[PDB]
Amino acid sequence: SMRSDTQAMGGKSYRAQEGKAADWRVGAATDLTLSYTNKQGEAREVTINAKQG
Amino acid sequence: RRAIQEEVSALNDELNRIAETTSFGGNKLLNGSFGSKSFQIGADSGEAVMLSMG
Numbered sequence: 001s002m003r004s005d006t007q008a009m010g011g012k013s014y015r016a017q018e019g020k021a022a023d024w025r026v027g028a029a030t031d032l033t034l035s036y037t038n039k040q041g042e043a044r045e046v047t048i049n050a051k052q053g
Numbered sequence: 054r055r056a057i058q059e060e061v062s063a064l065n066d067e068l069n070r071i072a073e074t075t076s077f078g079g080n081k082l083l084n085g086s087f088g089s090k091s092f093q094i095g096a097d098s099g100e101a102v103m104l105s106m107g
Contacts, residue, residue, distance in 0.1 A: 021089070
């Protein structure tokens with residue numbers, strides 16, 4: 001199906017609960033790990049070590 | 054001194070007028086209501102740049 005409401009024509013959107021202003025800057029805690037399941041069924045872990053500042 | 058102060062007050066009211074009335078297509082810029090806005094300059098989502106004017 002190619003109706004615009006088809007599940008394959010979209011995804012899942014997550015949003016932050018805390019708002020950060022334009023003066024916010026990453027401190028000493030920066031790691032962010034995304035752990036989920038890929039489409040083939042294997043568990044996939046992606047680790048993002050952001051840059052301080 | 055009152056003669057000088059009158060020109061100071063006239064220019065003082067001019068400073069507030071510039072801040073309030075300056076706009077880009079109706080959107081105020083220098084009145085402090087612009088805040089910070091992200092300008093999207095990428096071919097993919099999430100590639101914007103913040104601009105702030107106090």
